[PDB]
Amino acid sequence: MFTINAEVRKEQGKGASRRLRAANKFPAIIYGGKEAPLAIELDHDKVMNMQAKAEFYSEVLTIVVDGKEIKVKAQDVQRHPYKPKLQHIDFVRA
Amino acid sequence: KVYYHHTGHIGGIKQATFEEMIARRPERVIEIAVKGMLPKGPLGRAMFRKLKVYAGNEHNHAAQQPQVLDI
Amino acid sequence: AKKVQAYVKLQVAAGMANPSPPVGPALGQQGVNIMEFCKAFNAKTDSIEKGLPIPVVITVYADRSFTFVTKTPPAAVLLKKAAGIKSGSGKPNKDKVGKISRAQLQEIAQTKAADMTGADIEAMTRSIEGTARSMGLVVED
Amino acid sequence: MLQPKRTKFRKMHKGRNRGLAQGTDVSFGSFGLKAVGRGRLTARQIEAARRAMTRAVKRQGKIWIRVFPDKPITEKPLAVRMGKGKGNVEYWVALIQPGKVLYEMDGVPEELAREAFKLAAAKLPIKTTFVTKTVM
Amino acid sequence: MKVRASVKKLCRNCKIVKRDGVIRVICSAEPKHKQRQG
Amino acid sequence: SRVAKAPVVVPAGVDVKINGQVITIKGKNGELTRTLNDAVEVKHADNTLTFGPRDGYADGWAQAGTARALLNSMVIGVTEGFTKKLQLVGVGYRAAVKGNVINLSLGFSHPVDHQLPAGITAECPTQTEIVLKGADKQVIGQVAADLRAYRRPEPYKGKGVRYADEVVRTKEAKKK
Amino acid sequence: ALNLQDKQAIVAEVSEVAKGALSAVVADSRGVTVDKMTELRKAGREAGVYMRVVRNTLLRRAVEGTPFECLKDAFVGPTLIAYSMEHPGAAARLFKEFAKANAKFEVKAAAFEGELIPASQIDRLATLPTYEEAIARLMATMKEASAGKLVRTLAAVRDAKEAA
RNA sequence: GAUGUCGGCUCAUCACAUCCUGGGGCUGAAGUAGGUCCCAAGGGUAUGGCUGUUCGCCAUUUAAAGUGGUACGCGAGCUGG
RNA sequence: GUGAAGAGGGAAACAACCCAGACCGCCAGCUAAGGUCCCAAAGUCAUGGUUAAGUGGGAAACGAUGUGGGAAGGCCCAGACAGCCAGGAUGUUGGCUUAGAAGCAGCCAUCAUUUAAAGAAAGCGUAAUAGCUCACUGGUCGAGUCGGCCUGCGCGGAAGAU
């Protein structure tokens, strides 16, 4: 159903990931198939109000990064200690 | 804002309305508004004694020629 | 509030509207005189046997003036009569105290015909099925 | 109420938490109540919280309970000074820490499970927030 | 009637109204529901 | 929210004179029909009142319906005149009007001495019936409220002065 | 958008039969009161006349999607419409049964085979003669409305203005 | 290198979280009466016995016989009971 | 670490805090933490967002019909949002129960009738019917609104010896 976009991670380690969460962004990863795990940054409040419907996990996803499209479903979610805001989410190719 | 005092008698804080201080002796509302903005005891007593307000639209400094100021 | 109500319920034997207790209190609170109501109630019951419960539906105007429709007895009274049950089970469907055929319901439906709103003799019957079901009666085709 | 059957030793250290929990997501239920932050619970709340949820939900579904007061905690009597061995035994404590899910459900209809979980939270000494599982 | 704290709705016609910094329950079905604080 | 969006569109031959925030509604057949909008700012246009935010207040849509309501009330005030038939239930109390004076009893040894504002007049068919006449929707209820101060329609046996919305719900006697 | 078809579907539906109808009758009430109504709803389905009480949102939208003759001027305000596509005499008769218990002035207009039929003429349609007189009255209705009616109206406005 | 008490006389003062009148809301309150009760420091708030007694018991008045603090008020005031 | 064994600046005076490690004298400048309307040295700052509490600048449980922004999304002139009026019906006054039993005293029924339409009833009340609003329908009504979630701001709770 839902049609999103993503960026590839410029810097990785604690300092870059804190500078995402300071600015209401969070990280994620897309694994599976014959091909490598793909690390991306996402925007928190773009996707938080999409994932209010179950089709973001149940039905397949349009995800565009550098004009590449592979088809995807969402996987399990990591949340902040005292906020329901998304600290990190995992995804699988579908 | 009820201008609180306890001169020495009767249980309670004692008080005075906001309404008296403009309706009766109308100078006092400005006097004890600039008062706390001045330094310690003695120099603020010399700063303070330079203000007069009088009753209102009845000032007596006609002969000094006051320079009007809008704030 | 204006104090108008459409379709006030009362259910009382035809021979029992001379005392106030078969009438209960509720007419009294809305300003319907129990004596005046008793002259209005005997005028459509003269062809019904005494002790047989008469349906009465009342409309009341702002000044507690009142108009009354008196009816031939309920489908429920006749459906109890026709199955040979004195009273129902107090559980619809799950408790059975008889059964009733469709042809009997059709004879009820025609006795009810001026009270019935239905566009069909079939429609009229369909209304009293669920009344039969309420009294612990099976409507078998 | 949930508690450990028997314990290795009779007396243990009070402890503290380092600032994270590991059952922060719902994993027994399909929804639950999350602790927000941190504190102590005297086992009185476990009891009161199950009681609060069962009077509202009754025989529609199951409750899963995730807190148990595995740790003894002493009070030092008013007649006895400090530095003199630990006090008489006072209460048994479950330690909640940031993100710890307290109570979980599935069987009960979600909106009835939400009302039940608001009620348990009044029995608790701190503000809480309801969490839902989703697909993942 | 009791002053209380924390407001809940005793009837569908409790309007519930904030006059100054205090919530009064004001009702126009029954006057019985007139809780002074929420 | 439907009446916070309402455009008013004032009727013909009502003269609606705007100093910005004070609006004074003038016309034929009535006097003293006005608003000071203070939480919200009102532009008139030609006759289409438009509701938005004022400087130094925070509420939004909350007072905007209120300002709309109050301008329209006034417009109704000057045109037709708002309803007038006032009455009382309960023996030995009365609401008998006699000139500027409304004559009533509370068992009191002093006159209760309830009187009509210089901005209204009234007259009486019966000692429990009052008809008040005038063109301000505020004032007719404003003298009625002092009449209701100590004579409110009670929630058990209902006696009081009866006008507009009324709180009586019926209550029962101690159980037998 | 609607979530459901029901509110859009009934507009197309009512224009479809009401454009067709060989007789229809257009009336006003906003709370018809049920006792009289339930029994005329009964009696309409005894005659094979169909009766709707129907919204101005719906009526305005009816005008919008489907072209109408002679019924669109009586749509203004709260409106019931009873209508028949077969046995036109019954549509107008059902109103003369209702009039016994109601205001006979409550009619705004009727339509007959696409001709506009005035509040006075419909009383004549509601008479319902047996069949030789019936077919002859149905024709009288139509012949009258096409061209006689024009001349009727042009006189009815002139009298009011005429001063002595 | 000193903040020192009970009980008893004298003299108090401050917080109102009011014993009470005074204006008012509810009541499963008709009115009476009881239950519920907000506002409010302004003001009044008893005496003999026994005992070294705080507290106890008893007799009694008045519409009435308060709540909290004070080096658990007060020997640079009184007395060792 | 700091005081202990260290001045000064900031905090209202505050041994241990934040900045800093005082040779001494400097009526020379910058900068730190902290400040910048006056006490008191400097921003009543420029640009945009929001709020009624002296909240700000005093804290929780808890609670609702307090108020705005935002994106994703349903509703959305095919009439919203959801209040007011009018209708509120046929079986039916369901069954049992009871003086009588009427949606609402209790329990079981959770359905059916001409219908564009009216729950065998969401909430009140009644010793309990009675009286009442209510959707839905059809008048008024002619445009924004709310639930999920991110986000600013409020609230009462928050009463003691000067």
Task: Write a concise keyword list for the protein shown above.
part of a larger assembly, 7 chains, B: 71 residues, mainly alpha, G: 164 residues, alpha+beta, 6 helices, RNA-binding, ribonucleoprotein (chain E)
Short description:
Chain B has helices spanning 18-23, 28-34, 42-48. By secondary structure, chain B is mostly helical. Chain G has 164 residues and is of the alpha+beta class.
Report on this model:
The two termini of chain A are 13 Å apart. With 94 residues, chain A is of the alpha/beta class. The radius of gyration of chain A is 13 Å and the shape is globular. Chain A has helices at 14-21, 44-47, 55-58, and strands spanning 3-5, 7-8, 25-31, 38-43, 62-64, 72-79, 86-93. The longest helix of chain B is centred in the middle third of the chain and has 7 residues, at 28-34. Chain D has 136 residues and is of the alpha+beta class. Chain D has one domain: Alpha-Beta Complex (Aldehyde Oxidoreductase, domain 3), CATH 3.90.1170.10. In chain D, α1 packs antiparallel against α2 (110-122). The two termini of chain D are 30 Å apart. Helices cover 0% and strands 16% of the residues of chain E. Chain E contains no helices and 2 strands. Chain E has strands at 17-19, 22-24. In chain E, strands 1-2 form a two-stranded antiparallel sheet. Chains in contact: A-D, C-G, E-F. Chain A binds chain D through residues 51, 54, 57-58, 74-79, 81-82, 84, and chain D through 19-21, 24-25, 36-37, 98-99, 129, 131, 134-136. Chain C binds 2 RNA strands through residues 1, 3, 5-13, 16, 19-30, 53, 55-57, 74-76, 87-95, 112, 115-120, 123-124, 126-131, 133-136.
List the secondary-structure elements of chain B in sequence, H or E: HHH
* Proportion of residues in extended strands of chain E: 15-25%
Q: How many distinct helices of chain B?
A: 3
**What sort of overall outline of chain E do the alpha carbons produce when their principal axes are compared?**
globular
Helix content bin of chain E: under 10%
Number of strands of chain E: 2
Give the spatial strand order of the biggest sheet of chain E. Answer: 1-2
Report how far apart the termini of chain B are: 24 Å
The main sheet of chain E comes to: 2 strands, antiparallel
**Quaternary structure type:** part of a larger assembly
- Please state the CA-atom Rg of chain E, rounded to the nearest Å: 9 Å
Shape of chain B: extended
- Main beta sheet of chain B, described? none
Coarse structural class of chain B: mainly alpha
Strand content of chain B: under 5%
Tally of DSSP helical segments of chain E: 0
